[model samples]
Target: KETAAAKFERQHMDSSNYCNQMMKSRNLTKDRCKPVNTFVHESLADVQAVCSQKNVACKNGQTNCYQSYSTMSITDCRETGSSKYPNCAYKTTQANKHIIVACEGNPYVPVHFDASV
Candidate 1:
């Protein structure tokens, strides 16, 4: 019988395979992550354009409100096209954390990582 730690390790290994398979099937790739704006008035649109140009997605991104003194404008790219994930409802709540998708597949699914700063 396997110990709890052993079981966890086994599951972890199994999960890795699962993740690889999922990524392979969908042709998913790592996206270039952008840092939350250090200044104000940095709109989401800027982020979207940054990701879209490279076909990469943003992961858990949000601008720092206190870091800079100005109204940041982050545009929602979900409706601006370039989203491969269907039925995605872009949020406008102005949170400091969100995932920007670089879809792949039909209709311009963001695939693979491109050079993005």
Candidate 2:
């Protein structure tokens, strides 16, 4: 019998995969992905913390970081045009959500899902 957490995990496990499949179908490359529009409820501090771990600089007082898809390094968060701040997202864990669409390269951007319990 599956526990509640297990059930929820299984139910949503493929959430990311669904996005990946669509990107592949669109011929988005591993190095280039279709751009996305995203809106998440995380704070700047949380994203900055992630940047610290990833060794990337957070700009605008950790409010944003620019990633030029054409020359973006794997260490940076690529922009998703649908952000309320236009390439920015607030950091939060409670009932968190990510709106991944696609990009020209690296459509599967690793959003900072906070590990802090």
Candidate 3:
């Protein structure tokens, strides 16, 4: 099974050409592509630290959320501008922002990307 860390890397770690490449490489193109998402460019260990580094309330009102202590390089992908189902299109934008993630499991790891602040 793919670890949550690996899944996060595959789903949300890329630079300039992230959307075009990762969206397909991660097999998000199978049926309908992911509409909008964000990928953090920090190392896995750094990301994992967020679980214990900064505690915050989840957007969904969960108690297992954490916000990054520092700004991070990230790419935000949005399905806009003539985007259609099955045949996906995305707008890729890069930014340095604080990240919020939801962690799970005994040895906590990011399971869901909440948002970028």
Candidate 4:
């Protein structure tokens, strides 16, 4: 079973030269080109700490979100204009920003990515 914590790591964690490799290796591009996704280059523990704060509302109106205090390294993978299933192409971007994520309590870890600021 893919728990929220596991899914969070799968969808949002990665490395430096890692946008495309992680995207493909992690199965984000397995069957369909995930239209847009971001990768955070930070420790799982560090990101988990964000859940220890904030308590804000999420876009979907689940008020379990937290905004990280310190800035974190990140990457964005945007689908190419011609991307398609099983052959999804992407353009990479790098950034440093504070991340917002929705945390849920099956032990309180981030389960949803909200935004960057």
Candidate 5:
């Protein structure tokens, strides 16, 4: 099972290695490539606190969205080549911005990468 913390590291952490390599290891490349996504760099506890802060509207019509209290380090990933399945490529971008996340759980861990502001 994929934990929120694990997802954050795999999806957001920028390094010199293949950014999309985790796609195969994490099973995100099985069916099709996940086009675009962002990951926050704040501590896990800080992110979890978002659940108790503001209740914002989510893109998916869900009311479980929360905005980060402060700007956070983020790495944005976007596919770089053709959108063909099984041939995924990505361009990684590092940025600092506030983030909106969809969180779930008793402790309120982020489950979805909603957006960054």
Candidate 6:
């Protein structure tokens, strides 16, 4: 069984998944078009380590946020205005930026993607 931590990595730590069917194929569109999703093109190990990086304020005002020490390659996938479930469509934008994520767990790991900047 895939833990939510692992599932988080699968959906967010992508490398070659270009978009389109990649989102649906990976089960992001099951409930609905995920709307906004970001994929960091870095090793899962490195991303996991972000939990120990500099702490920051999360969008939810949580104190568990961590920002990456290095700028990272990432893909920004945004659903088109006309996108609808079952026919979810997206626009992709690749960029290099520092990542911020919300970490949670026993040993500590990223659970929610916060931002790319």
| Most lDDT-accurate candidate | 6
lDDT of 6 by residue, 82-117 (tens): 888878888988999999999988989998899987
| Clash count, one per candidate | 14, 16, 0, 0, 0, 0
Residue 38 alpha-carbon offset, candidate 4, angstroms: 0.6
lDDT-based ranking, best first?
6, 4, 3, 5, 2, 1
CA lDDT for candidate 2: 0.29
Q: Which residue pairs in candidate 4 have backbone atoms (N, alpha carbon, C) closer than 3 angstroms, thus clashing?
A: none
Better of 2 and 3 by lDDT: 3
Show model 4 residue runs off by greater than 4 Å. 15-17
C-alpha lDDT (0 to 100) for residue 53 of candidate 6: 93
At residue 78, what lDDT does model 5 achieve? 78
Model 6 scores what on Cα lDDT? 0.87
Clashing pairs in 5: none
Q: Model 4, poorest ten-residue lDDT window?
A: 14-23
Residue 47, candidate 6: Cα error in Å is 0.4
Q: In model 2, which runs have C-alpha deviations exceeding 4 angstroms?
A: 1-35, 55-117
Please give the range of 10 consecutive residues that has the lowest summed lDDT in model 3.
13-22
Lowest-sum lDDT 10-residue window in model 6: 13-22
Minimal lDDT window, size 10, model 5: 10-19
For 1-117, candidate 5 gives per-residue lDDT tens digits of 868756755665433234476555656667878877665667777776776767899999999998877888877767876656777777767788878878887666777768888
* Alpha-carbon RMSD to native, per candidate: 18.2, 16.3, 2.0, 1.9, 3.3, 2.0
Q: Which digits, one per residue and each the tens of the lDDT, describe model 2 over residues 8-42?
A: 22222222233333333433323444344122334
TM-score of each: 0.17, 0.19, 0.87, 0.90, 0.74, 0.90
Q: Note the Cα lDDT for every prediction shown.
A: 0.27, 0.29, 0.80, 0.83, 0.71, 0.87
